[PDB]
Design an enzyme around this catalytic site. Structure first.
Site, PDB file in Angstrom:
ATOM      1  N   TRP A 136      33.423  44.356  46.645  1.00 13.29           N
ATOM      2  CA  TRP A 136      34.688  45.051  46.462  1.00 13.29           C
ATOM      3  C   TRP A 136      34.537  46.528  46.113  1.00 13.29           C
ATOM      4  CZ3 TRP A 136      38.180  42.021  48.482  1.00 13.29           C
ATOM      5  CH2 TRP A 136      38.056  40.627  48.357  1.00 13.29           C
ATOM      6  N   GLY A 172      43.450  46.333  44.605  1.00 15.87           N
ATOM      7  CA  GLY A 172      42.485  46.886  43.691  1.00 15.87           C
ATOM      8  C   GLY A 172      43.196  47.430  42.475  1.00 15.87           C
ATOM      9  N   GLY A 173      44.293  46.773  42.098  1.00 17.71           N
ATOM     10  CA  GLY A 173      45.019  47.116  40.891  1.00 17.71           C
ATOM     11  C   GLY A 173      45.509  48.544  40.817  1.00 17.71           C
ATOM     12  N   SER A 230      47.179  41.861  46.878  1.00 19.63           N
ATOM     13  CA  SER A 230      47.164  42.270  45.457  1.00 19.63           C
ATOM     14  C   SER A 230      48.001  43.534  45.300  1.00 19.63           C
ATOM     15  CB  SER A 230      45.715  42.370  44.974  1.00 19.63           C
ATOM     16  OG  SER A 230      45.623  42.557  43.563  1.00 19.63           O
ATOM     17  N   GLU A 276      44.373  31.908  41.605  1.00 19.26           N
ATOM     18  CA  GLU A 276      44.500  33.360  41.511  1.00 19.26           C
ATOM     19  C   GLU A 276      43.813  33.921  40.268  1.00 19.26           C
ATOM     20  OE1 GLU A 276      45.548  35.453  43.589  1.00 19.26           O
ATOM     21  OE2 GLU A 276      46.815  34.338  45.008  1.00 19.26           O
ATOM     22  N   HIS A 316      41.392  34.787  43.741  1.00 20.45           N
ATOM     23  CA  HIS A 316      42.060  36.013  44.161  1.00 20.45           C
ATOM     24  C   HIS A 316      41.212  36.775  45.186  1.00 20.45           C
ATOM     25  CE1 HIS A 316      45.096  39.067  43.563  1.00 20.45           C
ATOM     26  NE2 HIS A 316      44.148  39.979  43.445  1.00 20.45           N
TER      27      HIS A 316
HETATM   28  C1  LIG Z   1      42.375  43.273  45.251  1.00 25.56           C
HETATM   29  N1  LIG Z   1      41.023  42.934  45.759  1.00 25.56           N
HETATM   30  C2  LIG Z   1      40.105  44.019  45.270  1.00 25.56           C
HETATM   31  C3  LIG Z   1      40.642  41.578  45.195  1.00 25.56           C
HETATM   32  C4  LIG Z   1      39.232  41.621  44.602  1.00 25.56           C
HETATM   33  N2  LIG Z   1      39.163  41.484  43.170  1.00 25.56           N
HETATM   34  C5  LIG Z   1      39.784  42.280  42.204  1.00 25.56           C
HETATM   35  C6  LIG Z   1      39.168  42.562  40.948  1.00 25.56           C
HETATM   36  C7  LIG Z   1      39.830  43.339  40.001  1.00 25.56           C
HETATM   37  C8  LIG Z   1      39.166  43.643  38.712  1.00 25.56           C
HETATM   38  C9  LIG Z   1      38.018  44.446  38.668  1.00 25.56           C
HETATM   39  C10 LIG Z   1      37.440  44.723  37.428  1.00 25.56           C
HETATM   40  N3  LIG Z   1      37.930  44.255  36.246  1.00 25.56           N
HETATM   41  C11 LIG Z   1      39.040  43.482  36.312  1.00 25.56           C
HETATM   42  C12 LIG Z   1      39.692  43.156  37.515  1.00 25.56           C
HETATM   43  C13 LIG Z   1      41.143  43.869  40.330  1.00 25.56           C
HETATM   44  C14 LIG Z   1      41.952  44.702  39.363  1.00 25.56           C
HETATM   45  C15 LIG Z   1      41.433  45.803  38.708  1.00 25.56           C
HETATM   46  C16 LIG Z   1      42.218  46.555  37.786  1.00 25.56           C
HETATM   47  C17 LIG Z   1      43.518  46.215  37.518  1.00 25.56           C
HETATM   48  C18 LIG Z   1      44.106  45.081  38.173  1.00 25.56           C
HETATM   49  C19 LIG Z   1      45.472  44.682  37.924  1.00 25.56           C
HETATM   50  C20 LIG Z   1      46.051  43.592  38.550  1.00 25.56           C
HETATM   51  C21 LIG Z   1      45.304  42.830  39.468  1.00 25.56           C
HETATM   52  C22 LIG Z   1      43.988  43.183  39.724  1.00 25.56           C
HETATM   53  C23 LIG Z   1      43.342  44.330  39.076  1.00 25.56           C
HETATM   54  N4  LIG Z   1      41.684  43.539  41.579  1.00 25.56           N
HETATM   55  N5  LIG Z   1      41.087  42.821  42.435  1.00 25.56           N
END
Ligand SMILES: CN(C)CCNc1cc(-c2ccncc2)c(-c2cccc3ccccc23)nn1
Ligand SMILES: *[C@@H]1O[C@H](CO[C@@H]2O[C@@H](C)[C@@H](O)[C@@H](O)[C@@H]2O)[C@@H](O[C@@H]2O[C@H](CO)[C@@H](O[C@@H]3O[C@H](CO)[C@@H](O)[C@H](O)[C@@H]3O)[C@H](O)[C@H]2NC(C)=O)[C@H](O)[C@H]1NC(C)=O
Ligand SMILES: *[C@@H]1O[C@H](CO[C@@H]2O[C@@H](C)[C@@H](O)[C@@H](O)[C@@H]2O)[C@@H](O[C@@H]2O[C@H](CO)[C@@H](O[C@@H]3O[C@H](CO)[C@@H](O)[C@H](O)[C@@H]3O)[C@H](O)[C@H]2NC(C)=O)[C@H](O)[C@H]1NC(C)=O
Ligand SMILES: *[C@@H]1O[C@H](CO[C@@H]2O[C@@H](C)[C@@H](O)[C@@H](O)[C@@H]2O)[C@@H](O[C@@H]2O[C@H](CO)[C@@H](O)[C@H](O)[C@H]2NC(C)=O)[C@H](O)[C@H]1NC(C)=O
Ligand SMILES: *[C@@H]1O[C@H](CO[C@@H]2O[C@@H](C)[C@@H](O)[C@@H](O)[C@@H]2O)[C@@H](O)[C@H](O)[C@H]1NC(C)=O
Ligand SMILES: *[C@@H]1O[C@H](CO)[C@@H](O)[C@H](O)[C@H]1NC(C)=O
Ligand SMILES: *[C@@H]1O[C@H](CO)[C@@H](O)[C@H](O)[C@H]1NC(C)=O
Length: 526
Positions: free
Chosen positions: A79, A113-114, A195, A322, A435
């Protein structure tokens, strides 16, 4: 293979896929680089160039912080960005079937990626498969993330907020002015993302300036009404100010603060984004979409509730587990390297992690509605409970509530429930169908026999890829040839959904109903 666009000539490259050919334009600029005095601003348009741009390799990913919690682990590093980080990062990719199509449906991909991380150059976002197999044109853009793309001084055009969303919207623009020269049909454009990308897609449904830029929308594990998706104007100020105090950029003229943050190196800004909120969660969206009054004209929950969105079809869905991904980024007792059987003390300890600024009583009510086990001896109880709590609160219940309210205004809606675990999935088995691990199936990666996927997975990818394209082409995600199960429309009375698995694809009703009443009706009162 040179294509003429409204801004000049671009040259792509020739790829061999499945004994056929896809043409790929990788890394076409769609906006003036948001640099110098352009940092934090809405993306300015692009001046004509008199040469031939070489769109033959992915461009720079936007500045961002990197998941370094699991170094060397493919599961987390698949990622992280796979190209140079730069602020010069407003580019996009086009995959056209070869031979050049005539009036092809366009799929436009917005990554998640949030709202802090992500890039289109990722392997599991490769759109040459869908170009090859379904004869669609696939676009994906890079858009600014984190404070560089979402810092908000409400009102001030020097930092108005929602810049990353305007990046995307200027990309849909580009497709509207230019895709017709690639063989695409600008009157048949389906946005899809996952996401924060899916939250992004649901926001273009609301933003009036994107109404005319796309036909339909696919939302994978995300919607604007999820708790992480919209930052308030309150918090967006306190977060902006705290970034300023953290960089010594605190001034009184709000304009001078932004000029101060502009003469700072992109890195100094990245490291201070962590601390702008005094307590974070693994799902902390530090700098996200705000109610800016340009892109988003009102609180989106009110816009949704009162029917103020684009009237069109939606494809909406979520994965079985999720929430598990986030449990190993902080929850006590968890690890990707053991089976993370947690005790009751550990479970409670984990609600403080995920619901930090929540009252004692509010944490107590989550424990209540998730710890009436049918069997109290099962030691995975609290481990599975905490996963569902995170997944139900952050993803599944907001996505169902989005589909109910949207469908109430007379539009076809289709809900799926992805419950297959990739045979190649590198995280442990207790984390389930996580997720983000439908994306490889959506993009048709299991269609490559070389990639060590199983045959049942090639067939499931085959069915999903057909369903997505048919929905893009025809607003109807059926697979009509290979005797598939018919996907019914999600009506808010019966609330029917389609499960997607490698065995029996089934029609079920009222996903996570008991859980979502808690999250959607009770829990918002606390
Ligand atoms: C959306 N693809 C990238 C799915 C793959 N995996 C992730 C991992 C994270 C993640 C990374 C590091 N530490 C925590 C979570 C996130 C993410 C990062 C930051 C804020 C968020 C808020 C809501 C939902 C996800 C995130 N997102 N996707
Ligand atoms: C954009 O792309 C063209 C075409 O090259 C194509 O794309 C590249 C990324 C590679 O994958 C190539 O294999 C592919 O064909 C570039 O044109 C090339 O420019 C060079 C540099 O000047 C030319 O060299 C000249 O050639 C002759 C000797 O044959 C002499 O007259 C000169 O002394 C000089 O060396 C070259 O012929 C030309 N074509 C090829 C096939 O290499 C173009 O520069 C590129 N633009 C970029 C990368 O900014
Ligand atoms: C599953 O693994 C987790 C995570 O622990 C980390 O990964 C493992 C695979 C090993 O490599 C560990 O060395 C590594 O830290 C375990 O959580 C950890 O459990 C231990 C023992 O219960 C905890 O240690 C205690 O910590 C507190 C506070 O500091 C004190 O009471 C004691 O001094 C004691 O050392 C530790 O906090 C905890 N670590 C983390 C990072 O959460 C977990 O126990 C393990 N469980 C199972 C059932 O497999
Ligand atoms: C609004 O922001 C203030 C300021 O945040 C502090 O300073 C930032 C630069 C950053 O490093 C944050 O982590 C800091 O917390 C917050 O005030 C802080 O509150 C915490 C507990 O909430 C306390 O321990 C700190 O000492 C406080 N620091 C200061 C300088 O006052 C505040 O909580 C935010 N809250 C609200 C309600 O608007
Ligand atoms: C391309 O087709 C145009 C009509 O598009 C049709 O309507 C939209 C809503 C989509 O559902 C799409 O699938 C349909 O085909 C024509 O008006 C236009 O002239 C055509 N142009 C070319 C060059 O083919
Ligand atoms: C802030 O500074 C800028 C730059 O000189 C100026 O245009 C603006 O009017 C100032 N505003 C206030 C309220 O001081
Ligand atoms: C239908 O089955 C045939 C038989 O091999 C296969 O080639 C084709 O890809 C299948 N299509 C879908 C949409 O599953």
């Amino acid at each position: 293979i040179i294509i003429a666009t409204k801004n000049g000539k671009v040259r792509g490259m020739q790829l061999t896929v499945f004994g056929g050919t896809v043409t790929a334009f990788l890394g076409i600029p769609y906006a003036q680089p948001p640099l110098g005095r352009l940092r934090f601003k809405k993306p300015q348009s692009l001046t004509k160039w008199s040469d031939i741009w070489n769109a033959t390799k992915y461009a720079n990913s936007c500045c961002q912080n990197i998941d370094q919690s699991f170094p060397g682990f493919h599961g987390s590093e698949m990622w992280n960005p796979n190209t140079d980080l730069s602020e010069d990062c407003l580019y996009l990719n086009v995959w056209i079937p070869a031979p050049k199509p005539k009036n092809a449906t366009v799929l436009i991909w917005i990554y998640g990626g949030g709202f802090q991380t992500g890039t289109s150059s990722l392997h599991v976002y490769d759109g040459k498969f869908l170009a090859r197999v379904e004869r669609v044109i696939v676009v994906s853009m890079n858009y600014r993330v984190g404070a560089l793309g979402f810092l908000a001084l409400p009102g001030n055009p020097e930092a108005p907020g929602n810049m990353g969303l305007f990046d995307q919207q200027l990309a849909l623009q580009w497709v509207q002015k230019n895709i017709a020269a690639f063989g695409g049909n600008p009157k048949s454009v389906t946005l899809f993302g996952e996401s924060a990308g899916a939250a992004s897609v649901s926001l273009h449904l609301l933003s009036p300036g994107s109404h005319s830029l796309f036909t339909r929308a696919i939302l994978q594990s995300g919607s604007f009404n999820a708790p992480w998706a919209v930052t308030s104007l309150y918090e967006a100020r306190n977060r902006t100010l705290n970034l300023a105090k953290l960089t010594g950029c605190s001034r009184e003229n709000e304009t001078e603060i932004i000029k101060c943050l502009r003469n700072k190196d992109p890195q100094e800004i990245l490291l201070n984004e962590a601390f702008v909120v005094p307590y974070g969660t693994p799902l902390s969206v530090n700098f996200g979409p705000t109610v800016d009054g340009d892109f988003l004209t009102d609180m989106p929950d009110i816009l949704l509730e009162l029917g103020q969105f684009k009237k069109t079809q939606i494809l909406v869905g979520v994965n079985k587990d999720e929430g598990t991904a986030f449990l190993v980024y902080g929850a006590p007792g968890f690890s990707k390297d053991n089976n993370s059987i947690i005790t009751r003390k550990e479970f409670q300890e984990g609600l403080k992690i995920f619901f930090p600024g929540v009252s004692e009583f509010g944490k107590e009510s989550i424990l209540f509605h998730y710890t009436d086990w049918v069997d109290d001896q099962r030691p995975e109880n609290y481990r599975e409970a905490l996963g569902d709590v995170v997944g139900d609160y952050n993803f599944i219940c907001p996505a169902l509530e989005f589909t109910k309210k949207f469908s109430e205004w007379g539009n076809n809606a289709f809900f799926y429930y992805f419950e297959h675990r990739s045979s190649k999935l590198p995280w442990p088995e207790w984390m389930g169908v996580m997720h983000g691990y439908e994306i490889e199936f959506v993009f048709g990666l299991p269609l490559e026999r070389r990639d060590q996927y199983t045959k049942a997975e090639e067939i499931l990818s085959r069915s999903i890829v057909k369903r997505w394209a048919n929905f893009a082409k025809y607003g109807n995600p059926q697979e009509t040839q290979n005797q598939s199960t018919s996907w019914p429309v999600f009506k808010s009375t019966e609330q029917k959904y389609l499960t997607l698995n490698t065995e029996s694809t089934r029609i079920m009703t009222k996903l996570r109903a008991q859980q979502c009443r808690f999250w959607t009706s009770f829990f918002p009162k606390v």
